[PDB]
Amino acid sequence: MKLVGSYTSPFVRKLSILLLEKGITFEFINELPYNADNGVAQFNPLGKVPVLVTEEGECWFDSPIIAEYIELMNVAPAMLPRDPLESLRVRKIEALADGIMDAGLVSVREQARPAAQQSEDELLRQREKINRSLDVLEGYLVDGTLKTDTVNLATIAIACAVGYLNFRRVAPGWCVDRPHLVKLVENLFSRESFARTEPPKA
Amino acid sequence: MKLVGSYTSPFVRKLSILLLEKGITFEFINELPYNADNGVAQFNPLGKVPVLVTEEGECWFDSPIIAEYIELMNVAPAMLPRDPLESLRVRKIEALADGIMDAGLVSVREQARPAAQQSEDELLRQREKINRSLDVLEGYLVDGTLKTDTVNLATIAIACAVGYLNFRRVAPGWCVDRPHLVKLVENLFSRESFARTEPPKA
Numbered sequence: 001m002k003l004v005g006s007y008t009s010p011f012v013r014k015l016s017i018l019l020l021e022k023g024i025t026f027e028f029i030n031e032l033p034y035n036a037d038n039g040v041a042q043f044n045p046l047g048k049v050p051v052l053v054t055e056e057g058e059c060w061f062d063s064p065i066i067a068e069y070i071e072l073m074n075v076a077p078a079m080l081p082r083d084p085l086e087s088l089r090v091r092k093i094e095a096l097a098d099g100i101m102d103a104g105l106v107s108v109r110e111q112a113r114p115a116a117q118q119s120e121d122e123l124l125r126q127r128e129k130i131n132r133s134l135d136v137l138e139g140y141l142v143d144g145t146l147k148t149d150t151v152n153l154a155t156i157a158i159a160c161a162v163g164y165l166n167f168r169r170v171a172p173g174w175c176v177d178r179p180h181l182v183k184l185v186e187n188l189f190s191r192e193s194f195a196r197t198e199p200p201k202a
Numbered sequence: 203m204k205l206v207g208s209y210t211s212p213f214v215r216k217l218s219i220l221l222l223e224k225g226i227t228f229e230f231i232n233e234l235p236y237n238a239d240n241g242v243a244q245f246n247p248l249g250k251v252p253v254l255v256t257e258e259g260e261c262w263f264d265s266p267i268i269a270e271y272i273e274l275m276n277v278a279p280a281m282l283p284r285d286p287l288e289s290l291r292v293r294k295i296e297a298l299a300d301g302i303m304d305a306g307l308v309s310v311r312e313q314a315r316p317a318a319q320q321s322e323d324e325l326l327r328q329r330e331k332i333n334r335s336l337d338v339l340e341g342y343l344v345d346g347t348l349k350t351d352t353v354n355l356a357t358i359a360i361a362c363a364v365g366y367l368n369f370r371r372v373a374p375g376w377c378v379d380r381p382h383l384v385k386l387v388e389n390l391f392s393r394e395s396f397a398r399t400e401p402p403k404a
């Protein structure tokens with residue numbers, strides 16, 4: 001199996017972590033999807049990472065689909081419950097976390113445009129999406145919808161999203177008055193799979 | 203059940219069509235997610251439509267998750283196969299179609315920014331994503347991975363994506379030398395569910 005990705009993408013990281021947790025052997029194929037010359041299109045016409053390539057040449061995308069493919073392999077530890085509705089509820093929370101990643105990425109890409117081309121309004125509305133979403137996550141933990149010791153596809157995705165926010169310096173107050181969220185991501189960050197997949201920083 | 207949406211969004215339209223096809227009663231709650239004052243955040247902290255609200259107050263997002271929720275209700279006609287791997291393969295194709303919508307939407311939002319803030323490079327790379335993706339879709343139909351008479355979640359999504367491209371006047375050559383794709387979407391557009399969900403045009 002090949003995982004086509006970048007070293008910074010949290011969508012990719014989510015999958016690297018699933019595979020590492022499950023002890024599944026894979027080769028990483030590094031790509032830079034925002035350069036003009038890159039090699040992503042042979043794997044995904046959308047030009048986005050991650051992509052998973054099976055040992056028959058089938059290319060899987062986007063990241064939630066790949067995570068389900070991996071789950072279907074049936075290798076411990078399970079990262080989704082077996083019950084269809086509860087699995088879908090975990091995957092709704094994964095979609096929330098993926099949306100935090102999306103908003104972080106939009107923010108970073110906005111700031112990569114030439115100065116005169118940037119929209120401060122765009123930055124503000126992405127930041128608001130992030131804060132509202134972090135509030136919903138804290139609420140799940142207050143309510144017991146999530147627990148701080150939960151390790152599943154949703155919580156992996158949440159910690160990847162927060163790790164990305166930190167890395168890119170988006171929403172520096174993510175931890176302010178969200179103490180359950182802090183505990184949850186610290187618990188995940190302590191795992192070897194997170195330690196081995198940190199984004200490179202100069 | 204409530205479907206929170208806009209009248210133009212193809213992500214929303216995909217779900218309106220599923221519900222209509224299945225004869226499932228719902229109320230539509232219209233929202234404008236790009237205005238500064240809107241009502242989407244009470245349903246989804248990401249501030250995006252669609253959202254599905256159940257008759258207990260649970261809010262489901264994003265669109266692929268909602269489509270699976272609907273499928274889980276087990277109401278004819280089925281829009282996903284029962285086998286887990288083949289269902290996931292249909293959902294991979296749905297992800298491709300959703301990515302075409304994404305690229306179309308990025309294009310439209312780019313063109314909504316003030317003139318001096320626009321990136322022609324951004325427009326070009328979204329257009330290329332679209333063309334490459336349309337080529338993959340045509341290839342699926344040549345290979346028999348899809349058929350022109352296939353009616354499932356993936357092909358609904360494909361026709362919603364193409365309908366959006368047409369509506370927004372993105373990728374006007376989508377039909378050029380993609381005759382299977384043309385036939386597939388014309389077959390879907392002929393259905394009442396598509397006729398009743400067309401985007402408003404002045």
Ligand SMILES: N[C@@H](CCC(=O)N[C@@H](CS)C(=O)NCC(=O)O)C(=O)O
Nearest residue numbers: 009011033047048049050062063064
């Ligand atoms: N919906 C996709 C989003 C993936 C995504 O946005 N990946 C970024 C890197 S973090 C990418 O490849 N961007 C290139 C582009 O948008 O052209 C998923 O969940 O995998």
Ligand SMILES: N[C@@H](CCC(=O)N[C@@H](CS)C(=O)NCC(=O)O)C(=O)O
Nearest residue numbers: 211213235249250251252264265266
């Ligand atoms: N991943 C989402 C994407 C939904 C989406 O992009 N919806 C657009 C309307 S077509 C939206 O609500 N945009 C508001 C925003 O991005 O702030 C899905 O599949 O539902």
